[PDB]
Structure formats: structure tokens, C-alpha cells
Design a protein around this ligand. Structure first.
Ligand SMILES: CN1CCC(CNC(=O)c2cccc(-c3noc(C(F)(F)F)n3)c2)(c2nc(-c3ccccc3)cs2)CC1
Ligand SMILES: [K+]
Ligand SMILES: [K+]
Ligand SMILES: [Zn+2]
Ligand SMILES: [Zn+2]
Length: 368
């Protein structure tokens, strides 16, 4: 393998679909990764990477994060809940194809893990995993919010257990809180979880991720929720997310000083997601710039994994900008008016609350 960025993709993950067929009623659809994949080729980025198929996560790998009941239920074939549309699912949004969902879920976990390992060995510089279904809502014994196995969490646990990375930063910029990821690593100080999400007083899915939630035991202070409050007006976008990176994410990340960075890279904070899917206005350029900023950490050992994002062009724009950043292309911050705008008052109060809480734990948060 050459020292460039790696891309993970495989058609096996397309097969995760409800039997009723309707991609509108079930918006977490195959087209999401399919369109990103062809977009990377159309724009000439795909051929510059090393393209990898990935693999099934083993039952053992799944059990490093999930319970035995959970893994039997979603990880294995029966032989070895009803929905309004007639298909089967765990709940109304989280569907279950009785032939393919388990396979596709295990592939997503397995492939994010395989990519992280290749990056951790410096066999690959960095990587982007174009996977579905998403993972960050799946917790120890609950599939929910379109998620079955927490691929990023499973990848992180394996890197640790195989001794391939001492300290791991997990950044989650999907607009929803990664409740699963927070839970798994809540008491482990060798994993730093930083989420930027729409919180709005706990009235936005999943409802978790309050600024107060800092971790526990040895892991106190190693869970950082940039929980945006105040709602959609004034608009939430680049000024606020750039501000979050300048003030919270990067300084804490640098103080932590990880050996590898994992990114739960959802693109549902992007333009084209209305309320109540997202309602935020983060541009593709900003996503690629955030990737570029995370590439300064951990000797450039960075792995992104697709979580959420529905609007096809928006998630294609963003994914394109992240891969370009991974390949070394740089974003000039002076090339965009609007990045000159101060962040809105809701974002400033949100960050102010994050700083008040985490000044107990981090020197870079301890002001006068
Ligand atoms: C149809 N009806 C009204 C529209 C509906 C609203 N969604 C939610 O309320 C909702 C609830 C739980 C979880 C999530 C969610 N969004 O991203 C993620 C992920 F895990 F990050 F990928 N989870 C979203 C939509 N969901 C999506 C969607 C598309 C791709 C991935 C996830 C959700 C588009 S519209 C679902 C229920
Ligand atoms: K998040
Ligand atoms: K932690
Ligand atoms: Zn259906
Ligand atoms: Zn999301």
C-alpha cells in the first residue's frame, strides 16, 4: 500500500434497505454512499487515493463495544417489530432487512476499523470511509437512530486493544449528538470525545449531550459537548463552527495530544437540511477546512467515517471537500467573505458554557 489517503467503499452496504422499497419514507438510503462514490470519480479525487473494499467486523470486534445479546440479535443469522409500511424494523426509523442489514452493518464497522489500522500503522497517511448504515447512535445494547453498531467506537476500541494507538481523539461534527460514542468512552481518559451538535435544551435527537456531561471517574473532563442552544435563528454555520474549532476543539485536542484522530463525519449540519433534520448552514469549504485543521494533530493520522447527511449534493459537496483536504489541498481562510463575520450570540453563549464547565479540567479553558 502507498502513503496516500485511503477510501473505503463496497456495494455490500447498498443492500441495507427496507423491503417496501421506498427511499423517501426511509431517507437513510443506498444512494447516499453511491452518489458520494461516483462524485469522487467525477471530480477526479477517487483515483488519487488507494481504494479499499473493507471487510466484515468479527463478532469479537462487535463485543468490544456492544453486549452479547446485541451482537447475537444484529450480528448473526437466525438459523446458525412490525412497521406501518409492512417492513420489519427495530423502531419506526431504524429498519431491518432480514437478509442484508446485519451484513452491511458489520461491513461498516469492519471497514472503518480496517482503515483506522492502516492509518495507525502509517501504511496510509489518512482516510475517508464511505459507509452506511451510520453508527454513532448505537450504544452498548440499543440500536437506534438508523444505527446498529458504532463503527467509530468499535474501531477505536480495537486500535487500543491491539496496542496500535495510545491516545485517541474522536471528533463528531454530525449535527446530532453521538450518544453511543459518549457512553462507550465515558470513563476512559485515553479517549477524548468532542461533539458539536444542535442541543436546543435537549429537544433535538437524541436529546443527550448537555455541556454538563464531562465524563466520569478517570474519564472526567475527557468528554466535551459543544452543545449549541438558542435554535435556528440567527443562522448557525461557518462562523460558529470555525469559532468552535479556534476556541474549543483544537486547543483541547492539542492539550490532549492524540496519536490518532477519528472523525464521526456526518454532513447533516450542511446547507440543504431543513428543520428538524438539521437546519444549519455549514458549507463544504468549512468541512474541508475542519479536516485540514484536524490533520495538524497526531502526525496527520486522521480517519473520517460517514455518519449522517441526506441532501445528496450537500453531502457530496462536503465529502468532496474533506477528501481534497485529506489529499493535501489547502483552504485559504481569506478567500471567503462571511468567514469574516463574527459568530452569532447563541453560539457565543453556547461556547461560553462549554468553557465555564471545562475550565475545571483543561488549562487552555482556564481564563481569568
Ligand atoms: C421521516 N420522518 C421525518 C423526517 C426524518 C427526521 N429525522 C429525525 O428526526 C431523526 C431521528 C433520529 C435520528 C436521526 C439521525 N439523523 O442522522 C443520524 C445519523 F445517525 F447521524 F446518521 N441520525 C434523525 C428524516 N430523517 C432523515 C435522515 C437521512 C439520513 C440519515 C438519517 C436521517 C432525513 S429526513 C425521519 C422521520
Ligand atoms: K455531533
Ligand atoms: K473519555
Ligand atoms: Zn418500509
Ligand atoms: Zn445526524
Amino acid at each position: 500500500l502507498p502513503f496516500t489517503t485511503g477510501l473505503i467503499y463496497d456495494s455490500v452496504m447498498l443492500k441495507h434497505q427496507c423491503s417496501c422499497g421506498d427511499n423517501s419514507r426511509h431517507p437513510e438510503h443506498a444512494g447516499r454512499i453511491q452518489s458520494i462514490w461516483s462524485r469522487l470519480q467525477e471530480r477526479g479525487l477517487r483515483s488519487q487515493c488507494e481504494c479499499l473494499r473493507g471487510r466484515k467486523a468479527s463478532l469479537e470486534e462487535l463485543q468490544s463495544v456492544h453486549s452479547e445479546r446485541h451482537v447475537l440479535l444484529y450480528g448473526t443469522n437466525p438459523l446458525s417489530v412490525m412497521l406501518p409500511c409492512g417492513g420489519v424494523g427495530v423502531d419506526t426509523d431504524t429498519i431491518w432487512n432480514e437478509l442484508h442489514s446485519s451484513n452491511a452493518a458489520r461491513w461498516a464497522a469492519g471497514s472503518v476499523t480496517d482503515l483506522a489500522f492502516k492509518v495507525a500503522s502509517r501504511e496510509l497517511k489518512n482516510g475517508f470511509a464511505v459507509v452506511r448504515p451510520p453508527g454513532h447512535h448505537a450504544d452498548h445494547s440499543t440500536a437506534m437512530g438508523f444505527c446498529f453498531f458504532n463503527s467509530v467506537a468499535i474501531a477505536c476500541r480495537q486500535l487500543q486493544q491491539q496496542s496500535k494507538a495510545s491516545k485517541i481523539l474522536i471528533v463528531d461534527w454530525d449535527v446530532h449528538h453521538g450518544n453511543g460514542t459518549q457512553q462507550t468512552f465515558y470513563q476512559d481518559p485515553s479517549v477524548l470525545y468532542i461533539s458539536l451538535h444542535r442541543h436546543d435544551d435537549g429537544n433535538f435527537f437524541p436529546g443527550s449531550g448537555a455541556v454538563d456531561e464531562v465524563g466520569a471517574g478517570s474519564g472526567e473532563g475527557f468528554n466535551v459537548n459543544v452543545a449549541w442552544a438558542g435554535g435556528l435563528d440567527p443562522p448557525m454555520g461557518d462562523p460558529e463552527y470555525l469559532a468552535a474549532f479556534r476556541i474549543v476543539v483544537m486547543p483541547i485536542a492539542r492539550e490532549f495530544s492524540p496519536d490518532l484522530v477519528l472523525v464521526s463525519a456526518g454532513f447533516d449540519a450542511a446547507e440543504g437540511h431543513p428543520a428538524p433534520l438539521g437546519g444549519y448552514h455549514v458549507s463544504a469549504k468549512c468541512f474541508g477546512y475542519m479536516t485540514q485543521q484536524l490533520m495538524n494533530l497526531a502526525g496527520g493520522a486522521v480517519v473520517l467515517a460517514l455518519e449522517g447527511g441526506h441532501d445528496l449534493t450537500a453531502i457530496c459537496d462536503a465529502s468532496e471537500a474533506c477528501v481534497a483536504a485529506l489529499l493535501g489541498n489547502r483552504v485559504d481562510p481569506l478567500s471567503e467573505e462571511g468567514w469574516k463575520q463574527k459568530p452569532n450570540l447563541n453560539a457565543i453563549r453556547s461556547l461560553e458554557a462549554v468553557i465555564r464547565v471545562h475550565s475545571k479540567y483543561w488549562g487552555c479553558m482556564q481564563r481569568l
